Amino acid sequence: KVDPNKIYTIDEAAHLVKELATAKFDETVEVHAKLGIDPRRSDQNVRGTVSLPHGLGKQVRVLAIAKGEKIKEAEEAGADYVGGEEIIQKILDGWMDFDAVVATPDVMGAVGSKLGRILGPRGLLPNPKAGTVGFNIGEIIREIKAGRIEFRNDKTGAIHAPVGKASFPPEKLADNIRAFIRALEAHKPEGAKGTFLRSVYVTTTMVPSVRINPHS
Ligand SMILES: [Cl-]
């Protein structure tokens, strides 16, 4: 009960995420967008933050994956669950309990290579360009906690970012996308070519993609 032909309004995807929302887990919503830009040229590489008016949810429980001291830095940041390969294994074991995952570059080769089949479809997979991956584990642990998200230029000019969860009532979820969008829009360079937002798409684990009208 999804139409490939159809282009969806921000509201229409929003209600459609809930239709398809399963109760076995609360799914993070993500907006994906093709930015008309050329990442090759450095001037349109887009970097910017926005505060989702309702955030990622209010009691955001964070899983930090890291090595070294940055593990302590991560539980002194106030992370609800910290760890290392033990933590990965406790996921493969089948433990999904967290609302968010963040990580240092250091472990990403392992987290990327192992957790990808599991975290990714649920929008729990750390990405540096979602501002969930970095050596400053402290800021990310708080910013994500503070509900602030930062987009970064993908290599092909994609962008992703968590917009919140499928349990959100849909109007509250709509406000998030337009918000992220509005702050996404703000960052177009001056010498950019045709329309800044080429394609934008809503996703969850049950809606592999919708294409939306970002101005609706
Ligand atoms: Cl179901």
The domains of the chain are located at: 3-54+148-216, 55-147
CA-based nearest residue to 168, from 10, 58, 3, 12: 58
Ligand 1 center–CA 18 separation, angstroms: 11
Ligand 1 center–CA 44 separation, angstroms: 41
Ligand 1 center–CA 28 separation, angstroms: 16
* Peptide-bond breaks in the chain following residues (C–N over 2.5 A): none
d(CA 127, CA 160): 9
Query: Which residues does 58 contact at the CB level (< 8 Å), separation at least 6?
Result: 147
Ligand 1 center–CA 169 separation, angstroms: 18
Domain 55-147 has CATH 3.40.50.790: yes
Name the CATH superfamily, with its identifier, for domain 3-54+148-216. Ribosomal protein L1/L10, rRNA-binding domain (3.30.190.20)
When computed from its CA atoms, the radius of gyration of the chain, rounded to whole angstroms, is 17
Taking the alpha carbons of 182, 119, 114, 105 in that order, is the dihedral positive or negative?
Answer: positive
Per the entry, the structure determination technique was X-ray
Query: Which residues does 210 contact at the CB level (< 8 Å), separation at least 6?
Result: 2, 8, 13, 16, 201, 202, 203
Ligand 1 center–CA 21 separation, angstroms: 7
Structure tokens at 105: 């570059």
What residues pair up with 31 in beta bridges, in sequence order? 161, 202
Q: Are 79 and 73 in contact (CB under 8 A)?
A: no
Angle made by CA atoms 9, 12, 17, in degrees to the nearest 5: 125
d(CA 119, CA 100): 10
Ligand 1 center–CA 23 separation, angstroms: 6
